[PDB]
Design a protein around this ligand. Structure first.
Ligand SMILES: O=C(O)CC[C@H](O)C(=O)O
Ligand SMILES: O=C(O)CC[C@H](O)C(=O)O
Ligand SMILES: [Cl-]
Ligand SMILES: [Cl-]
Ligand SMILES: [Zn+2]
Ligand SMILES: [Zn+2]
Lengths: 146, 144
């Protein structure tokens, strides 16, 4: 049936909330200094992209992919790769929408930072919470009604 | 034997994928989903006597829960990981036949997931599904 429709979009964030919540938990328990570099590298790129958010798309996906790689679980990275088009459709639709309200992108940036600090700090439940919050808020900014 | 580390990563991933699916199914299941899960449980109940195709009926049970999410990406990922599922399930079920009343204990773990989903209790569903994988990982002496 093809996969750009809004039911699709709600399904993507629905799946992300589980998959990326779990991945953040494992990452907080298993991340090495290389993983943290990969996450901070993506954040720094996003910080420079706050003014113009269509280049932010790849850096946004890249931040979440690094979180998946920080699980040290071979299967998690593959699932995110297998879903890369769905990730893009969700991340792209959202970053367009949030450039509409002033400063909203700076606010979304801190949703990412919150996931990074929790994973740095070693706290799995804090990491899972922050990751499910970036997504819940992203879906709610899009009125998806999960 | 030397594949403990890879079975643990499968069970690790299943725990997040299937916990989330079971909670989703508890919210969205319909009467067709219930029948599909219940028929699978009945097939697994019969396989206590004859072990043939028990792996397929176990997997068909977890696949049915994924269908009951009514989110197409849960089914795709489980189909995508079918080979990993088969290797874990078949490893676990042969190991479980080795101890006398073990496979009946496992059958109750499956039932408990269906019961939570039938009740429409997503937190209960999520815990039932992950307890099943945890205990299955314990039975295999893996260390998440
Ligand atoms: O919601 C936004 O403004 C950006 C999208 C978010 O970063 C995501 O990963 O889906
Ligand atoms: O642990 C067992 O004996 C059964 C394994 C379980 O059904 C599974 O889904 O992996
Ligand atoms: Cl950002
Ligand atoms: Cl069973
Ligand atoms: Zn994001
Ligand atoms: Zn099972």
């Amino acid at each position: 049936a093809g996969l750009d429709d809004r039911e699709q979009l709600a399904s993507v964030y629905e799946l992300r909330m589980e998959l990326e919540g779990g991945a953040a938990a494992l990452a907080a328990r298993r991340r090495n200094a290389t993983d943290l570099a990969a996450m901070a590298e993506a954040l720094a790129a996003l910080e420079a992209n706050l003014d113009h958010p269509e280049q932010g798309v790849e850096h946004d996906i890249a931040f979440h992919v690094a979180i998946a790689a920080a699980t040290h679980n071979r299967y998690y990275q593959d699932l995110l790769q297998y879903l890369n088009l769905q990730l893009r459709l969700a991340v792209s639709t959202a970053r367009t929408n949030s450039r509409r309200q002033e400063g909203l992108t700076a606010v979304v940036h801190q949703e990412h930072v919150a996931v990074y600090d929790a994973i740095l700090a070693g706290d799995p439940d804090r990491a899972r919470l922050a990751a499910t919050r970036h997504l819940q808020q992203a879906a709610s900014r899009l009125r998806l009604d999960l």
